[PDB]
């Protein structure tokens, strides 16, 4: 609409939209199976 009422200088750049989001070891082995039942294996071989 403002084109019809006033003139405009030319581009320096183009508009683009922006997006902001928020920001190997044995821990891999030892999270999904618990350390206590990791220790349970040392009982039957006794």
């Amino acid at each position: 609409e403002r084109e019809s009422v006033v003139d405009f200088s030319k581009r320096y750049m183009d508009y683009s939209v922006g997006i902001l989001i928020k920001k190997i070891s044995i821990f891999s082995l030892f999270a999904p199976f618990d350390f206590a039942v990791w220790a349970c294996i040392a009982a039957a071989i006794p």
Partner: protein
């Protein structure tokens, strides 16, 4: 003889111990989305209602004839309740609500450029976007003859890049913030405990 039979039982124990260790370490491949069409499946965005970022892709949400489908999907994702309980008033409201909610805030690139550097904790991340949405302009009244030589001075320094060079100046671009191994170490001190007990038994039986 029958020494062997019960030892054949501690087999399948360790078979299962092989097996669970084999399996679930594979399954670990929590966000894997880096673009707009990627971040479609990530619930809501955070925006300003009835805004220039809103109404433009609202208008592209009323364009049904092309199969882009990134846009109107997310638009009617946030057009629920007529836009109510989807949006904020100003982007000053969307800072911590994006930080403490399911929103990814959507705005100009250069604003988010500024907003990323202004986090002491630096707990944010911008993702890329290279699109042909709009341009930028500056108004001047009819009969003001300044337009051509203004844009001469625009196209000179943009074709020498100097406008973005000064944008690199007052806004830095190199990033203000930034932008297996355990078991082999684990056996080391265990072996050092071994050699400790060896020298312990060395002086133990030197004394014996």
């Amino acid at each position: 003889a029958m020494r062997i039979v019960m030892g054949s039982w501690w087999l399948f124990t360790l078979i299962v111990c092989s097996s669970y260790t084999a399996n679930l370490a594979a399954f670990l491949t929590p966000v894997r989305t880096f673009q707009d069409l990627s971040k479609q499946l990530e619930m809501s965005y955070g925006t300003v209602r009835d805004s220039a970022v809103y109404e433009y892709f609202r208008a592209k949400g009323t364009n049904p004839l092309e199969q882009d489908s990134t846009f109107a999907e997310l638009w009617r994702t946030i057009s629920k309740n007529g836009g109510a309980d989807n949006c904020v008033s100003n982007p000053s409201e969307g800072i911590r609500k994006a930080k403490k909610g399911n929103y990814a805030f959507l705005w100009d690139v250069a604003v988010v450029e500024y907003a990323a550097l202004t986090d002491d904790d630096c707990s944010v991340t911008v993702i890329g976007n290279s699109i042909s949405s709009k341009g930028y302009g500056i108004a001047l009244q009819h009969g003001s003859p300044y337009r051509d030589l203004f844009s001469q001075r625009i196209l000179e320094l943009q074709d020498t890049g100097d406008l973005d060079v000064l944008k690199q100046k007052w806004w830095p671009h190199t990033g203000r913030c930034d932008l297996s191994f355990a078991g082999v170490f684990c056996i080391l001190a265990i072996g050092l405990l071994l050699a400790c007990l060896v020298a312990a038994l060395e002086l133990w039986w030197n004394s014996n």
